[PDB]
């Protein structure tokens with residue numbers, strides 16, 4: 001049971017801009033996604049000081065970065081707060097609306113794409129490198145879900161009955177033909193060092209078996 005939804009026009013326009021614009025400093029996708037993960041981890045950590053049962057779905061607070069050259073994927077797995085069905089379909093796009101507008105206005109007027117994160121739309125920097133993005137997520141108050149979009153103006157949301165993640169978020173970046181450098185841990189390690197060296201959660205960089 002796949003449900004298909006249209007993005008708001010502005011977010012479809014943001015996505016096209018990110019896909020079509022000539023912009024070589026693509027590696028900032030990684031910083032933004034790790035930051036979203038850190039935020040999510042901050043959130044479940046904070047909530048659990050007043051409700052320690054919020055960790056019954058997992059005590060470890062961590063981020064894993066897993067390259068896979070033959071699937072052509074880069075996965076970022078966190079054990080943060082995760083996302084509900086409502087976030088995926090309605091809530092997150094509602095917040096993103098204003099962020100997308102301010103950002104667009106800032107690009108016009110000569111800000112650049114690396115500044116995307118200051119407007120709360122950093123997630124979409126994934127499309128700098130990924131042809132398709134799949135998000136597996138699990139919040140304590142909800143079922144596990146699979147969110148998916150290859151842009152083109154749509155996303156899908158379905159109940160995911162694959163392996164439980166317990167709590168948190170799996171971002172699977174299906175990378176573009178020309179973006180395979182990010183399937184290498186030596187390249188990923190370099191990008192983590194320049195941008196994300198002080199994240200206050202253990203970031204394990206997996207190694208290709210390849």
Ligand SMILES: CCCCn1c(Cc2cc(OC)c(OC)c(OC)c2)nc2c(N)ncnc21
Nearest residue numbers: 036037040080082083092096121123135147169
């Ligand atoms: C921007 C608010 C944060 C939403 N979010 C994000 C970024 C995000 C941002 C979204 O729109 C701005 C979005 O809807 C398309 C989304 O869904 C897949 C994700 N990553 C995480 C994460 N790893 N864990 C918990 N929440 C997250």
